[PDB]
From a paper:
Rate-limiting tetramer dissociation and rapid monomer misfolding and disassembly of TTR lead to amyloid fibril formation in different tissues causing various amyloid diseases. In the quaternary structure, the TTR monomers are arranged into dimer-of-dimers configuration and form a β-sheet rich, homotetrameric structure. X-ray studies of TTR show two funnel-shaped binding sites for T4, each defined by a dimer-dimer interface.
The compound C2 binds in forward mode by orienting its aldehyde and alcohol substituted aryl ring in the inner binding pocket. Ligand C2 has better fit inside AC site than the BD site. Besides, making polar interactions with the amide nitrogen and carbonyl oxygen of Thr118-Thr118′ and Thr119-Thr119′, the oxygen atom of the aldehyde group also makes two hydrogen bonds with the side chain oxygen atoms, Oγ and Oγ1 of Ser117-Ser117′ and Thr119-Thr119′, respectively, in AC dimer. However, in second T4 site the same aldehyde oxygen atom make only single hydrogen bond with the hydroxyl oxygen (Oγ) of Ser117-Ser117′. As a consequence of changed conformation in BD site the ligand make several hydrophobic and van der Waals contacts with aryl ring in the outer binding pocket with Lys15-Lys15′ and Leu17-Leu17′. Side chains of Lys15-Lys15′ also make polar contacts with the substituted chlorine atom in the BD site only. In this complex two water molecules are also present between the Ser117 and Ser117′ in AC and BD dimer facilitating direct hydrogen bond with the side chain oxygen atom of Ser117 in all subunits. The negative cooperativity is further apparent by disordered electron density of the ligand in BD site. The substitution of 3-hydroxyl in triclosan with polar groups such as aldehyde (as in the case of C2) increases the propensity for polar interactions with either Lys15-Lys15′ or Ser117-Ser117′.
Author numbering:
A (entry chain A), B (entry chain B), C (entry chain B), D (entry chain A): 10 to 124
The structure:
């Protein structure tokens, strides 16, 4: 697991469960191509997006479908989604955890790069 | 205006109006003594807490009464309050803005320090 | 001034000065077209991006060029940029402030929306 | 483990390792009494602070010694510490994770209350 996503809900003080997550990789023509996707588990985590073999250096976009998440709780959101865009590069052995904390009108995202 | 406090609501995407804020200063005897207090305005800002004469070097604690804010809005939040503790004016007089962003189970705080 | 952008530096506790910001608007053909751009001032704020006449209903993306900011400061950050995507003016014209707080491996963004 | 603390570093994009954490419980005379303490592990987590038997309802303060953490990395911090004050109450089975994301001049803390 070189790439993991973890989402928390700042209103309910809980993991954000069942949030759809789509990952894209930037192609040579500068369009985003689908790479990996899933929905966060009961722990608010999404594992198994990719493998070391398929997660080569390049530019990736992780889109967290926050608007749908809030609407399924009856709560009015501001953003369409939360987007995390970064260059993945091999400087050594490396796991990337993209973390996100959601409020209806605010979010934070952090990268935890380990090993 | 060497010390200003600004509070925003991450649920509503609005300034957090009428938030009580108490500032304390650590005394000679290691005790937290009352320094200044007030309530945020409609802009979510609290001005005029102190003057450059009375805001001497020291360790200060800005307590933002987040629980009272949320309960006045029918939300039962996690935290009693947000506390922000820092040494001030240790390299001469500066201007300090203490910002806080509030959600029911979460907050962030940042300090913007100028001159 | 229906759209304003404010950026702060969480490492230095200061406004994030000279940050490039590009705003796009989703077109009829589902494409991101250029809407407006600018650079933050010494207060970390970007004013005059648009006018109430030209800021119509639509889906907007505010891209904050965080990587360029950090690299100009000798820091090699994680993110390419901060992207903030939202529907605007769907319930009539409002005033939008998009705030961002930046660290090398992290950012938060909140929207304050008035009238 | 009813009470866990997890700390991340937003500058280094990594867990915050070896951060001292002191927990207090409010006594009847309104003073804070030491309750539990430790230092975050290589994962930035601190487990085993307490037990279900000893973590009764009451008001607790979790102080994260952020200033020492930053100084041991050569980086100038603003806060003395990060403080999280909350009422622990039994509404059902409940684990509390106090999470914190640190920057030199900013921090966020969230409560994740599960089970
Ligand atoms: O973006 C801000 C942010 C994102 C996530 C957070 O909680 C975690 C995030 C990642 C990991 Cl590995 C562990 C924890 Cl507890 C957090 O406190 C702040
Ligand atoms: O995530 C975005 C964000 C934006 C602002 C914040 O507090 C402030 C910090 C500096 C200034 Cl000038 C104004 C404010 Cl409201 C903050 O804590 C987070």
């Amino acid at each position: 697991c070189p790439l993991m996503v973890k989402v928390l809900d700042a209103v309910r003080g809980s993991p954000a469960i069942n949030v759809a997550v789509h990952v894209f990789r930037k192609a040579a023509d500068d369009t985003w191509e689908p790479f990996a996707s899933g929905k966060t588990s009961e722990s608010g985590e999404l594992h198994g997006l990719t493998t070391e073999e398929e997660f080569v250096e390049g530019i990736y976009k992780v889109e967290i479908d926050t608007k749908s998440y809030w609407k399924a709780l009856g709560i009015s959101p501001f953003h369409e989604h939360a987007e995390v865009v970064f260059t993945a590069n091999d400087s050594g052995p490396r796991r990337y955890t993209i973390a996100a904390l959601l409020s209806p009108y605010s979010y934070s995202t952090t990268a935890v790069v380990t090993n």
